[PDB]
Scaffold this active site. Structure first.
Site, PDB file in Angstrom:
ATOM      1  N   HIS A 217      53.427  55.677  12.796  1.00  0.00           N
ATOM      2  CA  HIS A 217      54.639  55.086  12.296  1.00  0.00           C
ATOM      3  C   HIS A 217      55.481  56.225  11.721  1.00  0.00           C
ATOM      4  CE1 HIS A 217      57.283  52.042  10.654  1.00  0.00           C
ATOM      5  NE2 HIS A 217      57.081  52.469   9.413  1.00  0.00           N
TER       6      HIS A 217
ATOM      7  N   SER B   8      62.327  52.267  10.211  1.00  0.00           N
ATOM      8  CA  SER B   8      61.592  51.138   9.622  1.00  0.00           C
ATOM      9  C   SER B   8      62.606  50.201   8.937  1.00  0.00           C
ATOM     10  CB  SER B   8      60.415  51.635   8.749  1.00  0.00           C
ATOM     11  OG  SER B   8      59.429  50.617   8.582  1.00  0.00           O
TER      12      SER B   8
HETATM   13  O1  LIG Z   1      56.491  49.898   3.926  1.00  0.00           O
HETATM   14  C1  LIG Z   1      56.172  49.943   5.327  1.00  0.00           C
HETATM   15  C2  LIG Z   1      56.340  48.596   5.913  1.00  0.00           C
HETATM   16  C3  LIG Z   1      55.225  47.842   6.269  1.00  0.00           C
HETATM   17  C4  LIG Z   1      55.383  46.580   6.836  1.00  0.00           C
HETATM   18  C5  LIG Z   1      56.647  46.089   7.032  1.00  0.00           C
HETATM   19  C6  LIG Z   1      57.738  46.852   6.679  1.00  0.00           C
HETATM   20  C7  LIG Z   1      57.608  48.103   6.123  1.00  0.00           C
HETATM   21  C8  LIG Z   1      57.071  50.869   6.040  1.00  0.00           C
HETATM   22  N1  LIG Z   1      57.789  51.605   6.574  1.00  0.00           N
END
Ligand SMILES: *O(*)[C@@](*)([C@]1(*)=[C][C]=[C][C]=[C]1)C(*)(*)(*)(*)#N
Ligand SMILES: *C1=[C][C]=[C][C]=[C@]1(*)[C@](*)(O(*)*)C(*)(*)#N
Ligand SMILES: O=Cc1ccccc1
Ligand SMILES: O=Cc1ccccc1
Lengths: 258, 259
Positions: free
Chosen positions: A236, A81
């Site tokens: 995710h 991420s």
């Molecule tokens: O904190 C989340 C996030 C959500 C949207 C954009 C970036 C990070 C994670 N991993």
């Protein structure tokens, strides 16, 4: 006995090294070495995010980890991420220490636009922030934007394929953090000679409800990778929903850079 | 549909609310409510243990949890290890908010001796602390002893029946903390009218390599409990090694204290 590797794992914003708790033993049981970095004001780091004003300060534990490797050691550097931004920053410093960068459900920055580019794009597109709490903190160098996930948002958009116990774990450990969007808008572009030069691959989860699959093509179109791997059924938080499959992809990666 | 309860869960020193991540959903699935308290300087609490100089400041999040409860609500208060101390402290303040204290693999203090008595006794005889790091921190109360577990000591004496993922989690999350034994040795004894008045049970793990089952008998012999439950095969971190069995014990407890 095939040669083993050193994997350096880099968590996402608002989380910490703990997310790797399932993956680490898997890789270590295959003979690999693992270093799970805890970034500044993350996890059990003792600083509040307010004290960590810049993305360089945020990333310093990862720079220190790499700086301390013995001469001529290289690692497989995994960024998850926002962790993609962290490992791009590291790669611009220590390119020769990195065998390959693994962008895991990650922001993949380029060497053409300002470093915030891919983050600013997602922030324009994304609709489902839910109960996330946004706030500011003024620093002597400008506004710093902070965020704290809300639990409903976590459940619907990050942890929807994870075991319930994982979701409860996360609720007890997540913290206010930052995506450093201001700081990263002012930073010098990532370099071709440093970050550009390092081998890179992308690993995406098929059911990531935060980093969508069109947004990944867009990033990759904009900045190419060697290879894309897909984790079927991952949310995710794929190191939590599909740790075995993630191990499988990382093991494949390690084989293509033996 | 039997009446369900509100469990308040209190972690051990050097840990945090996170230890309850398996037990919480089991209890919630069963219809119960669960509050897992994060004590000062613990888990993701933002203060270092050096800023938490007394056991009362250590315990304040739990006191605040009890203070906030609506009128007439009573909880099943579970204290794990050093968490026994904390829940005794709380029962001396809010005894009428507690249906029953559950001493889980825990220090069970009495109302005759100083509050540190039972810890002092284990500390006398305790095995080897392994790679645990001890340090001293100076304060306006005198010296505070701090401890940070070592990973070998953790593996051998706390987590030996836990899944390897849970030992890896704990390596990622454990913190320097304190048993407050100086502060506790100076504090007023726990009262009969408060702590002493509350219903209490004990739940022990048969393979607890920190709190041995002879020492537990000695504590219970010295301060009686209503019922003793055993979790066959549990290590010290029984909420991680046998969460389902722990849930079975707490469920039995809850059956005994519906009104
Ligand atoms: O904190 C989340 C996030 C959500 C949207 C954009 C970036 C990070 C994670 N991993
Ligand atoms: C507590 C008491 C004696 C030895 C070790 C501990 C540890 O902090 C736990 N739980
Ligand atoms: O800063 C507030 C905000 C709100 C929605 C999306 C992005 C930012
Ligand atoms: O509490 C401090 C201490 C030091 C050495 C051994 C045992 C305890």
């Amino acid at each position: 006995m095939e040669r083993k590797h050193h994997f350096v794992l880099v968590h996402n914003a608002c989380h910490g090294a703990w997310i790797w708790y399932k993956l680490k033993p898997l890789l270590e049981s295959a003979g690999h070495r693992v270093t799970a970095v805890e970034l500044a004001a993350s996890g059990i780091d003792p600083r509040p995010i307010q004290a960590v004003e810049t993305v360089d300060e945020y990333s310093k534990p990862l720079i220190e980890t790499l700086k301390s490797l013995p001469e001529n050691e290289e690692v497989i550097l995994v960024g998850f991420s926002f962790g993609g931004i962290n490992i791009a920053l590291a790669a611009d410093i220590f390119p020769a220490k990195i065998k390959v960068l693994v962008f895991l459900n990650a922001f993949l920055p380029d060497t053409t636009h300002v470093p915030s580019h891919v983050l600013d794009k997602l922030m324009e597109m994304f609709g489902g922030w839910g109960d996330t709490e946004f706030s500011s903190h003024e620093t002597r160098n400008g506004t710093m934007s902070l965020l704290k996930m809300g639990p409903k948002f976590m459940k619907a958009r990050l942890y929807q394929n994870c075991p319930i116990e994982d979701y409860e774990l996360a609720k007890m450990l997540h913290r206010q953090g930052s995506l450093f969007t201001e700081d990263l808008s002012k930073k010098e572009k990532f370099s071709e000679e440093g970050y550009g030069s390092v081998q890179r691959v992308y690993v995406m989860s098929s059911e990531d409800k935060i980093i969508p699959c069109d947004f990944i093509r867009w990033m990759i179109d904009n900045f190419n990778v060697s290879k894309v791997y897909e984790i079927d059924g991952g949310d995710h938080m794929v190191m939590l929903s599909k740790p075995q499959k993630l191990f499988d992809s990382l093991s494949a990666i390690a084989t293509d850079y033996m």
